[PDB]
Design a protein around this nucleic acid. Structure first.
Ligand SMILES: [Zn+2]
Lengths: 241, 99, 111, 94, 49, 173, 49, 49, 107, 181
RNA sequence: AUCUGUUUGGUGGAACCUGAUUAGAGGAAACUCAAAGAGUGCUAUGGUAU
């Protein structure tokens, strides 16, 4: 479909920092912060502007859950140019690097990861992207890395642990700005495999309310993934009513 | 097409005067000047008139498809409304028999 | 002519009403004309309401309230043949008297 | 379809024009007549609207566009094909 | 009966794709973009009231 | 050259912004839940999570049907009853006459759900929850609420009738 | 203004006791701590904050 | 008062004199403001005056 | 730029009507009015995808229309479809009318 | 005034500097604007006339129904108002209160009638031609744009003979004859 | 080609019908003059005043 020499009409998406490449097939793309290279072997699009050569990175929904959220039609993403974002569970630059593209040079992305092996590729990516601050630490103890993180406008949680409601909450209290963004991706099997996927999603939503995070929206990620839903919420300390 | 008699056409109000554009016979100078790109453009322009002819016909048939199913559904739908209407009458007899 | 003059309570604006009907509201110090009506009628006197934004003019038979730019806002049908006007600032009342020998108090805020 | 044989709902085929009259053309059926009648009535209705508008015209109507628009000697309105070149412009074109 | 219920079910799977997206195994070959295109101004998402 | 057709300037009610009436002046199509196969809720499996309505508690006491046990009889499965804050508020608001209905509704076996909306109208709170997760049973005997729930597809509806509970749209029974 | 701003109720402590409350005691040294009892025989220690 | 409060059997004062804790037999322990029109936030000097 | 190069103008016109390009595709329904800010870009393939998703240099062109016309399967398809449409549009028009008025003449 | 905060608004509920109850919804301004009335008290001088009609109609109402005097005068009142063109129908007596309005009088002004007779594009443009001395009613030129035209005299409303407007009309259709002018 | 006449694009916008609006609808300029709305920045610091 999108072969090497094929050329596309690139036009902006509804969300700031996201672009659509048209053609015989449509591709979600974000502008490359570090032109001339691919972090995980995605396709890249070059446009000649007056002439400098800018480069766009293809966002594959099947590899990045957030991308699958766009394509299904999330109404509100708190990620946008010039916003500080905290990414929990950054396995590697498959999805953080795309998030760094959206925020742009002005914004920053705090990628948090625990396991050392995938981290090593996170750090090597981070050198190419100045606006990414990789934090190789456990998300279950935010106190350990409090020196490194300021207020963050949005907190994105891709962490695959059974007790997500605690990690997202604890980092939300310390670092999320009031009225700030929260985006959580929930995998039904990981939290509790004994009960159906719908029950788990209802359970996680209730935990967020108890933690003062008014949830705005839930989307299921099919066909891109099975038993996944992305819940978008706002952190309302004043009152969730 | 419809041809209005000229007598009627002459005495028409200003709001409704039919614009009948006569053909031109004397060759206009611009018509004798304009350069029409030949060769590679010609094959690349006939194709555009090829594609748009398919596209309108595709839409004009799928649009006619909808109008075919629209007629069938509303006929089906009016039948349920009739049942919903006639059976509603009976309840208000059954209810107000008590009252 | 003749011209009846009333200043604002703060001295920032001047309201002049020619007898034959030239009403002008202006900032006399900086020389900016806020509004200028040429009512083809007899105007008897005028006053500034709570601030320079609004003013009232006593025309041939009725009083009219105007905006800063000269748009009329209300026609006070009740006040007939008003000859003199005054505005109580703290109470937000407009007072009138004239040939009828009736003293009418009108509240600008509630109308 | 309740209490009806499939034999009852049998297609009745449609006849054709006689060979002796084949020159004249296709034999008009009811369906093709209805198209002829509907189109004629649609056109006559517009003429009846245009005639009454002609009869009810007020000769004193004035529209600012009466200066720009022009009328032919017959009286039928003249519309420009595409909506005179100055000497300087023609010099550049030549 | 068995052959009919076999055919009824497979038809139902075809309609279910029209009603909603259904997982179909994921990724086959290089990612060739969105097959049928993406709509910028539409959100298929369920809003918390 | 004074213009022709001059007219006195006046306030225009229709177009003037300062007036309050003139001052005031991404389509969404919700996805059909993945848990739903036409009218069949495939996701729902035992044990069942169930939302209780205020009328359900009152009638249950009339018929001498214990909540936890009487339910386990109807579905032949473990049921995890859930009472929302709205339902709890309505019970308390009823008055001293219904103090027993309050005491049973506080039985520790009955878990409670927090809520995040100002009003205490429980009918709308339940209807929102069922629309958004197709993972709850609705236990209510109110005529109005039942009709709303029936329109929602894939939502089992439970009621107290006769001497014991009845479940309507729960195929696994 | 005093009447429109008179909003005395702030909230309730947790989910309450199973039975009626009949004994309330304060930690006269700590500002935000409160101990309650009920006819159920239950006693609870609260964090009012 | 409140429709949900049924027999006040215990009432006390927070040690800062700002809040009222009451216990009824419906089983809830409520908090109230000592002065309804007041608010707990730190007031600017222009508010205070 | 306001020039709106005919190559770019035709380029966008093939994306407005991309439903009719290939009879097996059948995208979603959308309007896609021309945006006020857009650019034209060329894809870059990964070196690991040399055999899978790489066009030969000769096949690459400056315009999409050139790439589309270059194919012979698509080119043959339109000629069949368009010829079918012309028959439908030309049926019963002035041409057919003259024949019916011609046969009425003895020869 | 700045947009009032909430606490202010509760304490200042009736305050409105731009709309008052005596204004009666600015029906005066609305009806001057639609039909382009220039003299301010034209609306109210009409408003007294409609009040006179309505008052008379009520007093006729309270009289007994079969009363021959009630028969005659209400027929007379409708026939006169219908002839003046204030009333479009003479069938119902109830129209005397429901369908007698200032706008019913304003629609018979010369600027409005020319607009209905298509002699102008808009009421504003109809007025300008009156003040320019293009419009005649009978052989009398009229510069007053408040001239009320009875139903009968709507027929003699016409351009002035030498008017440049008639020259454009006749020139547009190529029907200009300079002998007449 | 005093051949043929459908299609694509441009030009023009009769009648009927539908919707909105109406002292007709627009346009351009600015170190211009006004009346409002939203957002943002600024130690924005007397819990009781050297
Ligand atoms: Zn609730």
């Amino acid at each position: 479909g999108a072969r090497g020499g094929a050329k596309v009409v690139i036009e902006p998406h509804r969300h700031a920092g996201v672009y659509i490449a048209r053609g015989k097939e449509d591709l979600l793309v974000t502008k490359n912060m570090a032109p001339g290279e691919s972090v995980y072997g995605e396709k890249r699009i070059s446009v000649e502007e007056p002439p400098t050569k800018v480069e766009y990175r293809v966002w594959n929904p099947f590899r990045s859950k957030l991308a699958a959220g766009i394509m299904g039609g999330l109404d509100e993403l708190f990620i946008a140019p010039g916003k500080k974002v905290l990414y929990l569970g950054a396995a590697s630059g498959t999805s953080v690097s795309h998030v760094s593209d959206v925020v742009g040079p002005e914004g920053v992305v705090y990628a948090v990861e625990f396991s050392h092996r995938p981290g090593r590729e996170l750090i090597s990516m981070a050198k190419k992207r100045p606006n990414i601050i990789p934090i190789i630490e456990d998300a279950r103890h935010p106190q350990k890395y409090r020196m490194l993180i300021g207020m963050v406008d949005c907190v994105f949680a891709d962490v695959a642990q059974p007790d997500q409601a605690r990690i997202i909450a604890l980092n939300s209290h310390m670092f999320l700005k009031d009225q700030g963004g929260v985006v959580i991706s929930i995998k039904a099997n990981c939290i509790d495999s004994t009960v159906d996927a719908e029950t788990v999603f209802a359970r996680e939503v209730q935990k967020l309310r108890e933690e003062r995070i008014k949830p705005l929206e839930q989307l299921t990620l099919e066909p891109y993934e099975r038993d996944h839903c992305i819940v978008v919420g706002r952190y309302m300390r004043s009152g969730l009513k | 097409g419809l041809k209005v008699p000229k007598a009627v056409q002459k005495e028409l109000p200003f709001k409704s005067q039919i614009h009948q554009m006569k053909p031109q016979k004397k060759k206009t100078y611009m018509a004798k000047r304009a350069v029409v790109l030949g060769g590679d453009e010609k094959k690349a322009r006939s194709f555009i008139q090829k594609v748009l002819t398919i596209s309108k016909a595709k839409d004009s048939k799928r649009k006619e498809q909808k109008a075919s199913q629209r007629k069938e559904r509303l006929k089906k739908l009016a039948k349920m409304e009739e049942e919903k209407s006639q059976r509603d009458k009976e309840k208000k007899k059954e209810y107000f028999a008590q009252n | 002519g003749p011209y009846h003059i009333k200043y604002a309570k703060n001295g920032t604006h001047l309201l002049i009403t020619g007898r034959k009907g030239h009403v002008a509201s202006m900032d006399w110090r900086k020389g900016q004309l806020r509004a200028e009506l040429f009512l083809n009628e007899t105007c008897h006197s005028a006053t500034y309401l709570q601030n320079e934004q609004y003013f009232a003019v006593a025309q041939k038979k009725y009083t009219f309230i105007y905006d800063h730019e000269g748009t009329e806002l209300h026609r006070l049908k009740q006040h007939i043949e008003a000859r003199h006007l005054d505005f109580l600032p703290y109470h937000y009342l407009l007072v009138t008297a004239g040939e009828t020998g009736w003293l009418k108090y009108h509240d600008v805020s509630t109308g | 379809a309740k209490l009806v044989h499939d034999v009852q709902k049998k297609q009745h085929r449609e006849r054709s024009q006689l060979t002796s009259r084949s020159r004249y053309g296709f034999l008009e059926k009811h369906k093709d007549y209805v198209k002829r009648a509907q189109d004629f009535h649609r056109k006559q209705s517009t003429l009846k609207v245009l005639r009454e508008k002609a009869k009810e015209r007020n000769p004193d109507e004035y529209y600012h566009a009466m200066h720009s628009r022009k009328t032919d000697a017959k009286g039928l309105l003249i519309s420009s094909r595409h909506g005179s070149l100055s000497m300087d412009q023609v010099k550049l074109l030549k | 009966s068995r052959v009919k219920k076999r055919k009824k079910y497979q038809k139902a799977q075809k309609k279910l794709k029209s009603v909603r997206a259904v997982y179909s195994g994921g990724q086959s070959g290089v990612y060739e973009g969105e097959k049928t295109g993406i709509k910028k101004g539409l959100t298929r998402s369920v809003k918390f009231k | 050259t004074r213009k022709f057709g001059l007219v006195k300037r006046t306030l225009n009610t229709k177009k003037d912004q300062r007036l309050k009436k003139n001052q005031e002046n991404t389509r969404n199509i919700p996805q059909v839940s993945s848990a739903l196969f036409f009218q069949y809720n495939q996701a729902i499996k035992p044990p069942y999570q169930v939302l209780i309505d205020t009328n359900f508690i009152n009638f249950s006491i009339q018929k001498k049907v214990d909540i936890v046990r009487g339910m386990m009889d109807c579905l032949l499965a473990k049921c995890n009853p859930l009472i929302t804050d709205c339902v709890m508020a309505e019970l308390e608001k009823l008055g001293p006459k219904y103090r027993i209905a309050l005491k049973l509704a506080r039985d520790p076996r009955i878990k409670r759900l927090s809520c995040s909306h100002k009003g205490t109208y429980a009918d709308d709170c339940l209807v929102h929850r069922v629309l958004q997760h197709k993972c709850y049973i609705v236990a209510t005997n109110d005529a109005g609420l039942k009709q709303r729930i029936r329109k929602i597809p894939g939502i089992p509806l439970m009621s107290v009738g006769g001497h014991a509970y009845v479940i309507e749209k729960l195929p696994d029974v | 203004l005093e009447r429109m701003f008179a909003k005395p109720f702030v909230g309730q402590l947790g989910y309450g006791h199973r039975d009626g409350v009949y004994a309330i005691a304060k930690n006269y040294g700590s500002l935000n701590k409160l101990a309650t009892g009920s006819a159920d025989g239950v006693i609870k220690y609260w964090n009012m904050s | 008062h409140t429709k949900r409060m049924q027999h006040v059997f215990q009432v006390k004062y927070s040690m800062d004199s700002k809040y009222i804790i009451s216990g009824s037999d419906d089983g809830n322990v409520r908090l109230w403001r000592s002065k309804a029109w007041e608010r707990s936030n730190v007031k600017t000097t222009r508010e205070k005056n | 730029d306001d020039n709106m190069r005919r190559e770019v103008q035709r380029d966008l016109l093939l994306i407005k009507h991309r439903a009719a390009l290939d009879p097996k595709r059948h995208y979603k329904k959308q309007r896609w009015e021309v945006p006020e800010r857009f650019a034209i870009g060329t894809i870059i393939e990964d070196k690991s995808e040399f055999y899978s998703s790489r066009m030969n240099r000769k096949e690459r062109k400056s315009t999409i229309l050139e790439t589309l016309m270059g194919d012979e399967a698509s080119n043959k398809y339109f000629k069949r479809k368009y010829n079918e449409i012309q028959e439908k549009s030309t049926s019963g028009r002035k041409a057919h009318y003259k024949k019916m008025k011609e046969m009425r003449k003895k020869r | 005034v700045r947009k009032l905060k909430h606490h202010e608004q509760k304490l200042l509920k009736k305050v409105d500097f731009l709309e008052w109850k005596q204004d009666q919804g600015h029906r005066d301004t609305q009806v001057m604007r639609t039909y382009h009335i220039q003299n301010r008290e034209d609306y109210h001088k009409y408003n007294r006339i409609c009040g006179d009609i309505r008052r008379l109609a009520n007093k006729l109402s309270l009289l007994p129904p079969t009363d021959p005097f009630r028969r005659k005068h209400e027929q007379l009142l409708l026939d006169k108002l219908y002839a003046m063109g204030v009333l479009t129908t003479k069938s119902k007596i109830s129209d005397l209160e429901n369908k007698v309005t200032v706008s019913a009088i304003c629609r018979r002004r010369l600027p409005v009638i020319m607009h209905r007779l298509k002699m102008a594009e808009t009421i504003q443009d109809a007025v300008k031609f009156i003040e320019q001395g293009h419009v005649r009613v009978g052989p009398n030129l009229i510069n007053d744009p408040a001239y009320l035209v009875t139903r009968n005299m709507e027929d003699y409303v016409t351009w002035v003979d030498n008017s440049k407007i008639k020259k454009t009309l006749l020139r547009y259709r190529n029907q200009i004859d300079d002998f007449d002018f």
